[PDB]
Design a protein around this ligand. Sequence first.
Ligand SMILES: *Cc1c(COP(=O)(O)O)cnc(C)c1O
Ligand SMILES: *Cc1c(COP(=O)(O)O)cnc(C)c1O
Lengths: 375, 373
Amino acid sequence: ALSDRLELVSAKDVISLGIGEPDFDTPQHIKEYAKEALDKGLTHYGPNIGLLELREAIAEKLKKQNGIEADPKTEIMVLLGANQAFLMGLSAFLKDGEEVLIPTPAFVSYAPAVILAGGKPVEVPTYEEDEFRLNVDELKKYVTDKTRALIINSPCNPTGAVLTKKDLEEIADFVVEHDLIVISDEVYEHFIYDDARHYSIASLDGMFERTITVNGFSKTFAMTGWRLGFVAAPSWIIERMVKFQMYNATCPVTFIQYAAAKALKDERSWKAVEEMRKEYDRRRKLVWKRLNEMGLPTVKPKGAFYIFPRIRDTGLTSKKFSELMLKEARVAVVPGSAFGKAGEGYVRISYATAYEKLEEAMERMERVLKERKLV
Amino acid sequence: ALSDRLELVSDVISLGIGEPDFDTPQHIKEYAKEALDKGLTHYGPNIGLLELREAIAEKLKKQNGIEADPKTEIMVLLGANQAFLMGLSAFLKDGEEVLIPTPAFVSYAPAVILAGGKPVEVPTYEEDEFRLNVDELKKYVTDKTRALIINSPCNPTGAVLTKKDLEEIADFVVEHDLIVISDEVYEHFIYDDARHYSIASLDGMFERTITVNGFSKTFAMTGWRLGFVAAPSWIIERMVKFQMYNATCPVTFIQYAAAKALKDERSWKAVEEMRKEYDRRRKLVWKRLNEMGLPTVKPKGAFYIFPRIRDTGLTSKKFSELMLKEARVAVVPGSAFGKAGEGYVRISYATAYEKLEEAMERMERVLKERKLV
Ligand SMILES: *Cc1c(COP(=O)(O)O)cnc(C)c1O
Ligand SMILES: *Cc1c(COP(=O)(O)O)cnc(C)c1O
């Protein structure tokens, strides 16, 4: 019964570097469209699948930016945050013993959503030497004939890695050969740096039929507290997820759907996303310099707004290194072990905080690294 | 495993609408705009904002006599509808039974199937003004029964359980060591001699009770998706664990507007105005339905009325099929709310007075015309 699956799941001056959301505020003009919606009286229930005009704007964005062709009436569904998608998506198909492969270090909702859907998560390590990009040769070590799905997250949280098109082509070969469904969490697609490119696995030939691509407004617009996300997937999966929603949150907030549908079509939205991306890029270069500078070897992340320094050479546990940085440096970083077994030996730092707080946090980490001769 | 249980599930004047026709009171809309300007745009606690939980805790104390701790026993949800799946998922085990009074709201049985149990319908009867009767509950309990869901004022019937009904069902609940889920979203829309009481306020009941309520029906906020439950700590702790892998948290600036609205005089004023208008409409449709030849119990709460249709010789489904194309009015077959709903139709009077009168004339013209009386 679900209560059974739920008990198998667990878990003054101080700079928090543990944040997993934009420090920016929602762009003013998106605030303004939600005020207009309230005044227009968009107060009542909407369809379980989302407002058709939001789904249509989302079909346009997916085709033009991601190369995905999805039908608005049938294949895309609006959600209360992209987070709902893991449990509801996996529940449209996962049966009782089935395994889902999760590349690790991974976002924290993946494995519990698998356990709640009734399956068994199987962690597949990614490695520092590979700049944490998934390798299909690790996938092979873990396939069984109970494997039904793979979850991919690019750009990745906690790592900041982004899969290249060739990476995705190989993954696409493995998935088709093993007849898996891929769930692709793309919420960080627009925060990509240097010469990285965001490719969607559902745009490759023959792949839409087998992937659930999840995305949302939370990170690319700074709308985490607005609870609006979406999936584009085959209609037999969408059908099952809206039936689930009927008995869960019924439908998204309908005036926020209006604000967001207009926002996708507004030039100033995209302009604000580049503002934010240029500023996250500036902060990234600082924490990458400074962390390598103080002795913690760190891969330059190509996407999202997280960086993942190697702390294992200080001789500590990622949990003990988190304690020591909080007690003595008063900076909060999250243990890499919280992102799966392959995260032990690292710590997640979010640079979604003001440049200046990051500078100061970096000096404070330095001093107790030197002071406590951990180097 | 949840996939198998999903598999087990599921010129007209529409009278089938289950939501307020009113728009949200303007002052609540402005509190929302203000939260937006104040930047209340980021993630909040999974259990919901503490300001909102403290506000809900004084409302529950004052209006309902339920004492609950804002820190551990109140949780904000994305509509009250989340409470049934998530609340049942805190304790229900495989194949345990949940008693469901019928005619009932459509979420309850699918919510117990998704959670892993089996719904057992318990009939309510028009002779009893559709108030759940304990003798009927005695016939259906088993050693597999773990919970009971009650809904007062009730959708689809409009029935509201008496303080003595509650006292007797409370008895039954303790005797059978069940937990009760109490759906109280229509609490402010009660009429005539009716009074709303909360089963968690009685004698030792808080510990055995999940009470769900929200802002959708009382403040005309159905599209805002804000509801709440007050329940013991161990139920709340498991429901916010579930929310972390579900919708994460309600929308922050909506929560602030709801908090400021519980405290505003104009909110409670808005509610008497909507209650006064629904009562006017209710008198109209109860009168018109009986005199038109359809024996109808005068509902005492919510905004729904449930006329007897079976003496026309039609089934609930055939009668609404007839009314949709002959009268152009949409009513919903009683059989959609359980099998004790057969022979009846739910009409909602959450539409304008004028359209209700019109709708009533259209139904009366086709009743007399196909000699259905
Ligand atoms: C923030 C985030 C999400 C959740 O999106 P919400 O819309 O806020 O529910 C999903 N995936 C990752 C990897 C994220 O970091
Ligand atoms: C409308 C209604 C609800 C509340 O659903 P929301 O999710 O809050 O919109 C719950 N129960 C009943 C009986 C209802 O009629």
